[PDB]
């Protein structure tokens, strides 16, 4: 399992309950798990599984988000657990 302190190139598709938007739609996004830049529950959900794994977790959207909308938005994240160190 790829835990913190690693870079997770996760292709996470922001699916809003059946529908798929472009905002939360990220592909091979070289994310850093352990930078505290992503919301709580997101970066982690990817660090708990291995790589090349399809993490279609229905995560919520906290106020911390830069967008007012994703302050309280229960979204469906299709995170393709790809990870680069």
Curated annotation (Swiss-Prot):
Residue ranges occupied by any PPIase FKBP-type domain in the UniProt entry: 5-85
Cellular compartment(s): Cytoplasm
Disulfide-bond pairs as recorded: none
Superkingdom in the source lineage: Bacteria
Physiological role: Involved in protein export. Acts as a chaperone by maintaining the newly synthesized protein in an open conformation. Functions as a peptidyl-prolyl cis-trans isomerase.
Free-text domain note: Consists of 3 domains; the N-terminus binds the ribosome, the middle domain has PPIase activity, while the C-terminus has intrinsic chaperone activity on its own.
Family designation: Belongs to the FKBP-type PPIase family. Tig subfamily.
Protein name in UniProt: Trigger factor
Natural source organism: Mycoplasma genitalium (strain ATCC 33530 / DSM 19775 / NCTC 10195 / G37) (Mycoplasmoides genitalium)
Gene name tied to this protein: tig
Shown residues in whole-protein numbering: 166 to 250 of 444
